[PDB]
């Protein structure tokens, strides 16, 4: 089962990008998602979470507006 992270990718200063977590093996709607980051030799960091139900989230203070995490219930993604 598990989850599908898209492959690594390069972009550019400024700019913007989108990343995919595909879910297989259970209830997309139940349960909740979080995201995390490890920089160049760094203690891991929390990014944010989404309940895939209504869609409610919570972005930590220093990353609000920076990040935009979402879901698609039908694609279960």
């Amino acid at each position: 089962a598990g989850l599908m992270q898209s492959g690594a990718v390069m972009k550019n200063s400024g700019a913007s990008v989108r990343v995919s977590c595909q879910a297989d093996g259970y209830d997309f709607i139940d349960y909740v998602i979080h995201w995390f980051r490890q920089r160049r030799g760094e203690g891991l960091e929390w990014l944010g979470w989404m309940n895939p139900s209504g869609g409610g989230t919570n972005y930590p203070r220093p990353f609000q507006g920076k990040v935009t995490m979402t879901r698609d219930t039908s694609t279960e993604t």
Binding site: W46, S53, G54, G56, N58, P60, R61, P62, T73, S74
Partner: protein, 449 residues
């Protein structure tokens, strides 16, 4: 010492059973066929039948509870029911030559509503039916030409039209248990949802409860009493939504302020459609008004009632939502049949320290829901002619704590929600189901023949 048993003893334990409603009598008479959905719901014990309990304390857990999920499965069951025989809508996923508006109603109501035109099944099978109707912007979607749109649902989920005879009025329901099962009823006013509650009664026919349908804002609910109350399964867990109950009723007046007109379209036989017609006179957006200073003082007593957990001096701040579906990002709810989504943005741009008109926030109306993520079926909210006005009390709120990783520096909140079950927990906080066993045996120097 011998043994001797006793039938009727005071002993029970943690169990959860099936339970039944109770909808009293004066609801029973209103002629016009069927009501809410309580078809065979049996009326209420007209006397308060409760028994105070002496020197007993046991532990309520408002999240480990069950009758909340009982009522949840119940209401999605009767949701399915309600519409099950109602009119289908399969000939609406059709192309839609549309446009905007023609009346002096400001950009405040610019377009948004749409004047679509399209063919349709007649009563018969052969003839088509060139027709036209008016729709809120969120019911339609572009497709790559003049103005042909699609309904939002037609790539996801079929849709049925509610029988117009249904009315969306929450009615006080008395959930009542069977015997062998009792409801322990907590009777202090300071019970943060978890733990043992000393002040208790025993009850079977819980009070009349309206299953109010709203996000972020909790409507017509129960009061708290002295010191407004707040509850979390473990608030340090920010992700645990926070549910709050007021000791103070918040006045709220909502209004969809346009005089509509209805179209009994004939997609017959039998199945008749109900469309929007053109509107009477001016056009203005639905919205709601609330008493400014009462709002002020309630959020006062709140922010007073929180720093206890977060240090008598901490930085508080509120904000508009973290971005969700229209149900969670706004105050979604129903009034008088149709469905509002209120931009609750205006009531949180604030920061709180330590110890004049009235507020008009606007709401936009939508007619296409598939609620409880129950997609596969959508409900067409039929139109209502005339205008709509709505008196309501606000009694609680669903909120989200920001996780500002510091120590106890700055903590900020927003109206949470999404999971509807809390609007039930918020009146289920005060009940526990117990299975009694009337048997209990004791040793004693007593002989038989």
């Amino acid at each position: 010492l011998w043994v001797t048993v006793y039938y009727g003893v005071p002993v029970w334990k943690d169990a959860e059973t099936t339970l039944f409603c109770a909808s009293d009598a004066k609801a029973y008479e209103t002629e016009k066929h069927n009501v809410w959905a309580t078809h065979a719901c049996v009326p209420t014990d007209p006397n308060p039948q409760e028994i105070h309990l002496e020197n007993v304390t046991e532990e309520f857990n408002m999240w480990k509870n069950n009758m909340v999920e009982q009522m949840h499965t119940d209401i999605i069951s009767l949701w399915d029911q309600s519409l099950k025989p109602c009119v289908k809508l399969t000939p609406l996923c059709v192309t839609l030559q549309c446009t905007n508006v023609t009346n002096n109603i400001t950009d405040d109501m610019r377009g948004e509503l749409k004047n679509c035109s399209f063919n349709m099944t007649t009563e018969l099978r052969d003839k088509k039916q060139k027709v036209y109707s008016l729709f809120y912007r969120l019911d339609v979607v572009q497709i790559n030409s003049n103005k042909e749109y699609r309904l939002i649902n037609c790539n996801t989920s079929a849709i049925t039209q509610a029988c117009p005879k249904v009315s969306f009025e929450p009615i006080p329901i008395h959930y009542c248990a069977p015997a062998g099962f009792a409801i322990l009823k907590c009777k202090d006013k300071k019970f943060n949802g978890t733990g043992p509650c000393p002040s208790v009664s025993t009850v079977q026919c819980t009070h009349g409860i309206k299953p109010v349908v709203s996000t972020q804002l909790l409507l017509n609910g129960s009061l708290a009493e002295e010191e407004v109350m707040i509850r979390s399964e473990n608030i340090t867990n920010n992700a645990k939504n926070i549910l709050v109950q007021f000791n103070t009723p918040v006045q709220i007046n909502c209004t969809r302020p346009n005089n509509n007109t209805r179209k009994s379209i004939r997609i017959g036989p039998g199945q008749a459609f109900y469309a929007t017609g053109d509107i009477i006179g001016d056009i203005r957006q639905a919205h709601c008004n609330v008493s400014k200073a009462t709002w002020n003082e309630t959020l006062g007593k709140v922010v007073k009632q929180l720093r206890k957990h977060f240090g008598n001096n901490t930085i508080i701040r509120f904000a508009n939502s973290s971005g969700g579906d229209l149900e969670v990002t706004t105050h979604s709810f129903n009034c008088g049949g149709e469905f509002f989504y209120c931009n609750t943005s205006g009531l949180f741009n604030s920061t709180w320290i330590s110890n004049n008109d009235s507020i008009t926030l606007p709401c936009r109306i939508k007619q296409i829901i598939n609620m409880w993520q129950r997609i596969g079926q959508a409900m067409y909210a039929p139109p209502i002619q005339g205008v709509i006005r709505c008196v309501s009390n606000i009694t609680g709120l669903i909120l989200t704590r920001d996780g500002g990783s510091t120590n106890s520096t700055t903590e900020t909140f927003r109206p949470g929600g999404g999971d509807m079950r809390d609007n039930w927990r918020s009146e289920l906080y005060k009940y526990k189901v117990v299975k009694i066993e009337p048997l209990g045996v004791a040793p004693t120097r007593c002989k038989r023949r």
